[PDB]
Amino acid sequence: VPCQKRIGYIKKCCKGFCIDILKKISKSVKFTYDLYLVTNGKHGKKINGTWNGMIGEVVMKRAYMAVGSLTINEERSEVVDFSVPFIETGISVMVSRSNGTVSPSAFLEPFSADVWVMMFVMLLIVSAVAVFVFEYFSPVPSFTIGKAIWLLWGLVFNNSVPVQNPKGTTSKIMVSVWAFFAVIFLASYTANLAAFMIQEEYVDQVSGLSDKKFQRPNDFSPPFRFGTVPNGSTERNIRNNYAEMHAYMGKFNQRGVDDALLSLKTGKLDAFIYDAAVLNYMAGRDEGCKLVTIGSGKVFASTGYGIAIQKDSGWKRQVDLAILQLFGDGEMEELEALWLTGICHNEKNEVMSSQLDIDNMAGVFYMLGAAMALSLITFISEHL
Amino acid sequence: KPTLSDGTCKEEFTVNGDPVKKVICTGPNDTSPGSPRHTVPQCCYGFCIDLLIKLARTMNFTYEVHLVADGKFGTQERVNNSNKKEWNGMMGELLSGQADMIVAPLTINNERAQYIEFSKPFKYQGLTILVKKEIPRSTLDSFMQPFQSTLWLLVGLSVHVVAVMLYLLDRFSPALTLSSAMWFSWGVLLNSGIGEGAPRSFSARILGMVWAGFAMIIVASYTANLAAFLVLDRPEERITGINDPRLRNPSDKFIYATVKQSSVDIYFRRQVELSTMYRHMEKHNYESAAEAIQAVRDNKLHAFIWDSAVLEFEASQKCDLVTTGELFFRSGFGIGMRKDSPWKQNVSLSILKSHENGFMEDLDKTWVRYQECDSRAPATLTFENMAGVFMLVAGGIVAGIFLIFIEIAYKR
Amino acid sequence: PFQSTLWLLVGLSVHVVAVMLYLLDRFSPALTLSSAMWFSWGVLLNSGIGEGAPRSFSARILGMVWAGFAMIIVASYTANLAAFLVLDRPEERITGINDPRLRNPSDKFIYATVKQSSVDIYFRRQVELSTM
Amino acid sequence: ELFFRSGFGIGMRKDSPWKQNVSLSILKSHENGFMEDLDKTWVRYQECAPATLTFENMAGVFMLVAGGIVAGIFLIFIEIAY
Amino acid sequence: VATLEERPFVIVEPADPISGTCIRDSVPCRSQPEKRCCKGFCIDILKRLAHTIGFSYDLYLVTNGKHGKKIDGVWNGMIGEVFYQRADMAIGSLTINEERSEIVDFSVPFVETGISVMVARSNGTVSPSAFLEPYSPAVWVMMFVMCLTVVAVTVFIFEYLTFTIGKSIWLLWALVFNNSVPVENPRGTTSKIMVLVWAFFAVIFLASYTANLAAFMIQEEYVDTVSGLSDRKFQRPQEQYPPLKFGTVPNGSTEKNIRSNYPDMHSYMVRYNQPRVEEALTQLKAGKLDAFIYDAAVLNYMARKDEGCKLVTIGSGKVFATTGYGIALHKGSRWKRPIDLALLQFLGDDEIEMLERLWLSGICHNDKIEVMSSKLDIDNMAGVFYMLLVAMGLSLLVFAWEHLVYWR
Numbered sequence A: 001v002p003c004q005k006r007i008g009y010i011k012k013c014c015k016g017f018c019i020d021i022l023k024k025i026s027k028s029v030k031f032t033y034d035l036y037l038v039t040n041g042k043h044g045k046k047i048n049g050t051w052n053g054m055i056g057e058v059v060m061k062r063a064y065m066a067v068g069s070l071t072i073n074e075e076r077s078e079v080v081d082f083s084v085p086f087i088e089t090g091i092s093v094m095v096s097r098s099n100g101t102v103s104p105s106a107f108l109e110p111f112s113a114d115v116w117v118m119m120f121v122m123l124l125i126v127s128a129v130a131v132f133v134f135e136y137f138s139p140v141p142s143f144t145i146g147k148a149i150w151l152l153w154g155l156v157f158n159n160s161v162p163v164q165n166p167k168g169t170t171s172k173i174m175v176s177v178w179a180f181f182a183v184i185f186l187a188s189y190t191a192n193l194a195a196f197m198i199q200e201e202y203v204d205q206v207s208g209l210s211d212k213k214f215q216r217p218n219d220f221s222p223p224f225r226f227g228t229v230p231n232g233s234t235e236r237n238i239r240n241n242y243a244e245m246h247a248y249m250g251k252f253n254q255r256g257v258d259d260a261l262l263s264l265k266t267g268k269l270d271a272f273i274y275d276a277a278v279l280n281y282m283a284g285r286d287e288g289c290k291l292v293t294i295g296s297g298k299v300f301a302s303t304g305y306g307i308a309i310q311k312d313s314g315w316k317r318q319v320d321l322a323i324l325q326l327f328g329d330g331e332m333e334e335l336e337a338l339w340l341t342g343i344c345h346n347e348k349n350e351v352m353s354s355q356l357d358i359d360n361m362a363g364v365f366y367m368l369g370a371a372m373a374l375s376l377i378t379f380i381s382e383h384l
Numbered sequence B: 001k002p003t004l005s006d007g008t009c010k011e012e013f014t015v016n017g018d019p020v021k022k023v024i025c026t027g028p029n030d031t032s033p034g035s036p037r038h039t040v041p042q043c044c045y046g047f048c049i050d051l052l053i054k055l056a057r058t059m060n061f062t063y064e065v066h067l068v069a070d071g072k073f074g075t076q077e078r079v080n081n082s083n084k085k086e087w088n089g090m091m092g093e094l095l096s097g098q099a100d101m102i103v104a105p106l107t108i109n110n111e112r113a114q115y116i117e118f119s120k121p122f123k124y125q126g127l128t129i130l131v132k133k134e135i136p137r138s139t140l141d142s143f144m145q146p147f148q149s150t151l152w153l154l155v156g157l158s159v160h161v162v163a164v165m166l167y168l169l170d171r172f173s174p175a176l177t178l179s180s181a182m183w184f185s186w187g188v189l190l191n192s193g194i195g196e197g198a199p200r201s202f203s204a205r206i207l208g209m210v211w212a213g214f215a216m217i218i219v220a221s222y223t224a225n226l227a228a229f230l231v232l233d234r235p236e237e238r239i240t241g242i243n244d245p246r247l248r249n250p251s252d253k254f255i256y257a258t259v260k261q262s263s264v265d266i267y268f269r270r271q272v273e274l275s276t277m278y279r280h281m282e283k284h285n286y287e288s289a290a291e292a293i294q295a296v297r298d299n300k301l302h303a304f305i306w307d308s309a310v311l312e313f314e315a316s317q318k319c320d321l322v323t324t325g326e327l328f329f330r331s332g333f334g335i336g337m338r339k340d341s342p343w344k345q346n347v348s349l350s351i352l353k354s355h356e357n358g359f360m361e362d363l364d365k366t367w368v369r370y371q372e373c374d375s376r377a378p379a380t381l382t383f384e385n386m387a388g389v390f391m392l393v394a395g396g397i398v399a400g401i402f403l404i405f406i407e408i409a410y411k412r
Numbered sequence C: 001p002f003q004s005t006l007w008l009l010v011g012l013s014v015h016v017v018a019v020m021l022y023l024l025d026r027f028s029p030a031l032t033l034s035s036a037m038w039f040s041w042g043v044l045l046n047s048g049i050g051e052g053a054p055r056s057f058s059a060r061i062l063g064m065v066w067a068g069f070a071m072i073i074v075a076s077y078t079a080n081l082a083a084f085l086v087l088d089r090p091e092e093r094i095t096g097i098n099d100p101r102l103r104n105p106s107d108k109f110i111y112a113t114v115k116q117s118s119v120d121i122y123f124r125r126q127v128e129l130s131t132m
Numbered sequence D: 001e002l003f004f005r006s007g008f009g010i011g012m013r014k015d016s017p018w019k020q021n022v023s024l025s026i027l028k029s030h031e032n033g034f035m036e037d038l039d040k041t042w043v044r045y046q047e048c049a050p051a052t053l054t055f056e057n058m059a060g061v062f063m064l065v066a067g068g069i070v071a072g073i074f075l076i077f078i079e080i081a082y
Numbered sequence E: 001v002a003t004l005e006e007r008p009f010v011i012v013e014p015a016d017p018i019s020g021t022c023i024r025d026s027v028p029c030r031s032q033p034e035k036r037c038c039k040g041f042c043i044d045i046l047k048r049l050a051h052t053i054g055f056s057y058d059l060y061l062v063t064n065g066k067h068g069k070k071i072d073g074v075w076n077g078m079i080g081e082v083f084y085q086r087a088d089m090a091i092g093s094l095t096i097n098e099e100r101s102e103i104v105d106f107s108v109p110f111v112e113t114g115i116s117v118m119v120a121r122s123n124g125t126v127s128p129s130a131f132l133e134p135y136s137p138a139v140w141v142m143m144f145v146m147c148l149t150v151v152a153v154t155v156f157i158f159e160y161l162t163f164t165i166g167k168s169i170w171l172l173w174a175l176v177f178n179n180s181v182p183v184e185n186p187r188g189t190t191s192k193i194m195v196l197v198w199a200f201f202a203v204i205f206l207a208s209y210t211a212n213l214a215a216f217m218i219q220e221e222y223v224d225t226v227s228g229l230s231d232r233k234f235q236r237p238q239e240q241y242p243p244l245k246f247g248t249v250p251n252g253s254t255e256k257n258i259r260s261n262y263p264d265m266h267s268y269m270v271r272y273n274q275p276r277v278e279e280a281l282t283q284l285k286a287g288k289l290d291a292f293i294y295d296a297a298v299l300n301y302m303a304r305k306d307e308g309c310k311l312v313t314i315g316s317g318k319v320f321a322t323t324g325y326g327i328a329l330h331k332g333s334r335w336k337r338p339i340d341l342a343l344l345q346f347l348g349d350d351e352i353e354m355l356e357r358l359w360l361s362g363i364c365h366n367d368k369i370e371v372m373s374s375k376l377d378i379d380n381m382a383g384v385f386y387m388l389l390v391a392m393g394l395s396l397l398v399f400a401w402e403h404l405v406y407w408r
């Protein structure tokens, strides 16, 4: 689309999401356009009681329309009429992909708790019958209950301890048939435990910007870090409703947005807060795929974009209808994906190889520690 | 909610102890459309009624909420009298003049925007898919799965074949008895500690050795196949939104339902690509959104195309359901009023003003975003899957019971 | 499969169990800190070393759960190696058009074709494929 | 996958009178099995693994076995003397 | 315009009696005539050309034959409706043919048609030599070599306190093979510690083996079979294994090509001559048959639209005698250039592809995109039994040597 530019009127070529939307509206409502790109300011900001930018030229009646990434507000809505939004917008939060996740107590997922107790009780009965039924009633130190348990328990848990094997044709068979159960028990346990650490996936959660991470940042956790681009809509919006938050955010100002992503790409900044309209888009086309648009669908100020029109303009009614027509015919997602969809918008599985550590497995040693103390209660009681 | 005694709303408190403000709706009870009913006071509360109360606190106007008569959101359809199209539900109640303002979840579109003004949306949401969340169940039978049922009975003979060979290879070369070869050949396979007769010759050692290497491979291959079967075989019937091929074509994925005379129906009408998909569900669309969700828990309908602002609430409370797919039709709600409405300029401004006050965030925090169970599939081995092994060792006790009496009788 | 700090901690729990077994067996109303290590090290590495039978009730239960912990380490190590090995297909097949590396120029996945010909006429036909 | 299905051709000018017979002759070679002989002779011929462990990725464990041998020589002397 | 009703191409439905007029997104096709509308794939091609070229039409279903035919003097069916000045075009499921090309002229094909082959889905093998796979011969052979060094060291390291080399090999090999056999342990601490070091390698070696063995039969897909029409296994089955059974629908285009090329094909294939396309699938699905041969554009669609996805074709570029579809004309109709230009526009663009994701598609995917791990059976691991069978024979060889040493 042809475009103008002050300083002299140099011709220029225009194309973009608003332009193609304007093209669709142009033929739909049969109105023509002679786009002239603004020079003074950007978007608009009421400074010294006067409006500049795209809004400023409309209210001086120099434009009669202001397409672009104009965010609907109430200061503008009482000066320039607005159309129906064609894209949502919020105040989202950006966090890293965490490079995977760990699952504590990752040693008990297989063998639902009914299986352990069922095997444990029948482990005692097999030991009981072996030294009572098939030993006391069979030909041929002897085989006590303690030795029988010490053996059958060993066989299940990858038998390596010294054992006192039974004597007798039937006692050997009973122990032998129990060893086959141990093989299936051990083989299936390892196989099932492999499944639980293959589909571990990734865990990401922020619970919005109204949670303790952004309401009590100086909690027991280390100080959370989050910054925005100052002198903008997000800072103006957050400074009013969130008085305390604005003071805290001042310590991590990030000026240029691309500079902030460097902090996220280096880990210097814990999280990034900015408008969700571009934050989702920028992370969509982001290289490295280490940024996720967390907080999606739950943002602070869901106010969409729009096409500003002159106050009480007759074209306002015919513009909203035209925009809604493109919504009903399933067109937005065509151009939404055409222009701003990125490539890092695939499935969020991101299964990664585990790096099992003390953090990954903790209760495994606690059971050893608990049993270490559990021996003590049976150690003092031996005196009594 | 039904009104309590004395014809007044019951007293209730929120999570924070604040009173949940209630209004006296005057609408039908136990509707059952197609049968005579009567008007009766009813108790209403929730999101779209708190935002209504804050609205009345700004423009200084009174109200008396009455529920819709028929029970449908509204859709301009042609009456039997030729093609004189006439609205229904809320839109009929608003255009006629009985209603003045429609403060309810009401997706806006061209067909509705032409006759009424709509004001700015007070919440942004799309349309998703609600299906029954299948519990992770391991489809594992007894230990007969990893190996074919025609392989164990040949491995077992090979155990004896080595045993007879080992004994024959030791009673002739320049020792172990026959029973020792039986125990040793087994004892390697099941990894049991029984069996004290090791091979003696340098020719019996190798036969009893390569058998041991074969014993490890059989067990190791068992572990590998069980891991391969368990990891690979998981129930994968998840639907990734309307773009899923099952939804994109007429298929018997049970039933896909919606709500009759809603925005979803008209969205499915103007798209001629899926025109027959909409005609497919024309004989399946329910009369209310509340009933259809109950059908999903009844496994009579494993799909639902409804506003994502509503499904996510049910996917958090009724945690036996889960939502799937990506919002494929994003359009905000609207406090619609009749054309030439003096309140139109005030109402739209207050909706936009409430967004940045934080109040509009407060409402969805109490109502929609108090959060619940999410979870959202590695199945765990259960007694049902592993009952085969316990049966064998349980049968081993009774097998030896009939073997001890014949073992002692051997001496006599 | 195990982080370097896990080995050190699992390398002292065997010794911590070893001294505990000797301490508990010495006050039972011949581990002598020599057969205790063989019992402690033998179970973990699945080697039939030593005949040490901890006759004490307190020691035997520790040994009974010592084997259980030893089984977990070997079982988890196999599974982690299995999980790591199966998740080693980073080839990232293009799967034709509509691929993440193809939709936008990654500046690292260079891909070209023959000048003129039909592909250039094909690609230039659609404004959608003007990004790459 | 083949994302652009469009076969080759035999281009000629608009006024060429060979178009009728060339198209008829090229269509006759498809049915005759002839065009199943050229690709058999020129194209179809010459029709010439989950990352096995290999010695790589395992030199450490075999170094441990070798390391035990070296440490043993430094351990036998102390054990004999003590 | 003449057209024929076909299942994936042209669907004819009664006009909506409730509204009187027929449903939208359809064309009012009469017959040769109650008012009635139809839809499908070829219909959408026709209506798109109308917008582009700028021409009207009046469809009517042909009631003479199927896609035209020669009755030895008179051309009937859809083609005959154009050869006899009755119809200007014959858009539908019309296969371009040499004989039809000299009586009517066609357009640029928009759908490819060939001669394909069906087969039941293959379950998939497990690489019957899989046990030696999750390693390398360098690791396999040298680990045996490594133990020989350790065994020699262990005997020497234990001598400086009746072990001997024989028991050291037996003991060391025991640990590396999931130790369950009787063993003799040393007494010296230097030899006892060294065994533990080898025991640690035994745990790692066994753990690595079973870990990678799982991966071998997880990332393996399932194709396991590719066959071609020109292959002798298809050409003649009477000089090979139990004959492969394959048939088609006679009295059609596929039979003409299979008759002119291989006369013996026509003679042999009449044993299994299924007269119904759908019935042949049931026989193929019941194990009665082994391959159904028909046009690609009509057999790929039935392979895609099939529950269970149990039917997979091998017509992935192996279609033989491939002639596309097309729009017939009057051989002088002067519509050929505008039709060809517009038809090539859709092919040049990605227009026809969307209509392929439509009716000419199904939920089932002919590509594998699926892995299955089944029971190991006997064939898939008979290789490990052969290693044992070597040992039994090798042990007998040692037995004779153990016997003949005394006499010599």
Ligand SMILES: O=C(O)[C@@H]1[C@H](C(=O)O)NCCN1C(=O)c1ccc2c(ccc3ccccc32)c1
Pocket (backbone or CB within 6 Å): A043, A044, A069, A070, A071, A232, A233, A234, A257, A258, A275, A278, A282
């Ligand atoms: O709302 C705002 O803050 C303003 C404006 C308004 O009406 O005021 N409404 C829209 C937001 N915006 C901005 O200045 C702004 C700031 C940064 C980026 C972009 C747009 C695209 C990007 C791409 C990459 C990095 C940064 C950006 C717009």
Ligand SMILES: O=C(O)[C@@H]1[C@H](C(=O)O)NCCN1C(=O)c1ccc2c(ccc3ccccc32)c1
Pocket (backbone or CB within 6 Å): E006, E007, E008, E066, E067, E093, E094, E095, E096, E252, E253, E254, E277, E278, E295, E298, E302
């Ligand atoms: O080539 C052929 O043999 C003819 C014709 C010609 O030019 O003669 N060319 C096209 C193929 N065809 C047929 O008769 C034929 C045979 C079978 C089905 C269909 C069409 C749709 C189906 C749907 C389901 C099952 C079978 C079919 C057409």
Ligand SMILES: *[C@@H]1O[C@H](CO)[C@@H](O)[C@H](O)[C@H]1NC(C)=O
Pocket (backbone or CB within 6 Å): B342, B343, B345, B346
């Ligand atoms: C809307 O608000 C303006 C400003 O507060 C007020 O002047 C006007 O009267 C309001 N509209 C109505 C119908 O009261």
Ligand SMILES: *[C@@H]1O[C@H](CO)[C@@H](O)[C@H](O)[C@H]1NC(C)=O
Pocket (backbone or CB within 6 Å): D017, D018, D021
């Ligand atoms: C094309 O073939 C026909 C058939 O024999 C012949 O009569 C005609 O002359 C040929 N045309 C040309 C240009 O050779």
